[PDB]
Amino acid sequence: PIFLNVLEAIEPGVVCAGHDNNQPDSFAALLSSLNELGERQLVHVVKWAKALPGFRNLHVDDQMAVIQYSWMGLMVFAMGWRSFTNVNSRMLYFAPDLVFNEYRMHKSRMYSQCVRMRHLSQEFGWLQITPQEFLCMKALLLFSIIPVDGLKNQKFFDELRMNYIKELDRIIACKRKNPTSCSRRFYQLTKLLDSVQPIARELHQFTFDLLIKSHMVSVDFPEMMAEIISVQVPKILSGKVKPIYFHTQ
Ligand SMILES: C[C@]12CC[C@H]3[C@@H](CCC4=CC(=O)CC[C@@]43C)[C@@H]1CC[C@@H]2O
Numbered sequence: 083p084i085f086l087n088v089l090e091a092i093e094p095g096v097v098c099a100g101h102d103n104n105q106p107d108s109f110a111a112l113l114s115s116l117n118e119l120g121e122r123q124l125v126h127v128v129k130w131a132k133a134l135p136g137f138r139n140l141h142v143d144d145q146m147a148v149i150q151y152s153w154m155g156l157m158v159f160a161m162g163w164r165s166f167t168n169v170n171s172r173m174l175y176f177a178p179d180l181v182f183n184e185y186r187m188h189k190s191r192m193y194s195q196c197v198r199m200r201h202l203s204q205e206f207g208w209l210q211i212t213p214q215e216f217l218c219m220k221a222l223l224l225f226s227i228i229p230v231d232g233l234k235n236q237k238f239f240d241e242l243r244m245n246y247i248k249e250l251d252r253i254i255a256c257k258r259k260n261p262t263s264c265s266r267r268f269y270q271l272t273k274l275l276d277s278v279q280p281i282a283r284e285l286h287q288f289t290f291d292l293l294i295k296s297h298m299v300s301v302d303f304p305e306m307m308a309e310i311i312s313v314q315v316p317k318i319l320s321g322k323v324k325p326i327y328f329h330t331q
């Protein structure tokens with residue numbers, strides 16, 4: 083249970099958005115708080131990524147790259163898990179102080195993306211995802227998006243990712259008998275994981291589009307979000323960096 087003990091030990095606690103719930107729900111106010119929340123969650127993502135088994139064996143530029151590419155997917159997934167465990171997926175639980183009901187979903191102007199996020203959230207319920215399956219899936223999301231012409235040390239990346247797939251396959255296969263059950267299950271979970279990607283990508287277009295018009299629309303982006311969204315996110319939009327799918331889309 084060593085790999086699982088570590089994944090349960092390094093898991094972030096609650097991150098607050100710092101949203102002032104006494105302000106009226108406006109676009110400016112909702113998206114600036116989401117942006118601050120993304121910025122706060124980045125600090126914790128960085129510290130979590132670095133405590134992961136084998137992570138520091140990656141080349142150091144590569145460690146920065148996988149995090150600056152995959153943060154959107156990791157946070158969407160974790161948020162869907164929080165929504166599921168806290169409000170049985172009925173609303174989007176970004177943070178204790180920034181929970182979206184239907185009105186916030188409309189005012190944020192991301193209503194259809196929110197719907198797709200609630201759908202992802204509900205799959206945790208429909209699939210009866212266990213906390214152990216959750217933590218191994220989210221660890222893998224870290225290794226699920228890279229540049230098309232490879233990382234600085236692609237071989238070390240490939241080995242690591244292989245090992246994360248094997249740990250997920252093992253977290254399933256601890257507790258099952260005569261096995262159509264075990265294939266069907268791995269199939270289900272690799273389908274859930276592939277499904278995070280098109281969602282992440284919608285939110286990549288959205289937040290890029292917003293950063294560009296952010297002065298016209300009084301939305302604040304803090305230091306790191308603004309930098310990652312202008313430097314790394316367009317490499318995803320332009321197709322220089324692409325998700326690693328299990329099944330072909
Ligand atoms: C990227 C973004 C700010 C950060 C958001 C993102 C939507 C999903 C998301 C979920 C979280 O739980 C952390 C914040 C993030 C990562 C927002 C959509 C537009 C906005 O600019």
Ligand SMILES: Oc1ccc(C2Nc3cccc4cccc(c34)N2)cc1O
Pocket residue numbers: 124128141142143144145146147149150306310
């Ligand atoms: O080897 C390393 C790999 C990634 C990082 C790392 N990656 C980051 C991405 C985005 C924002 C950051 C802000 C502060 C520190 C970081 C960031 N640190 C630091 C390292 O020293």
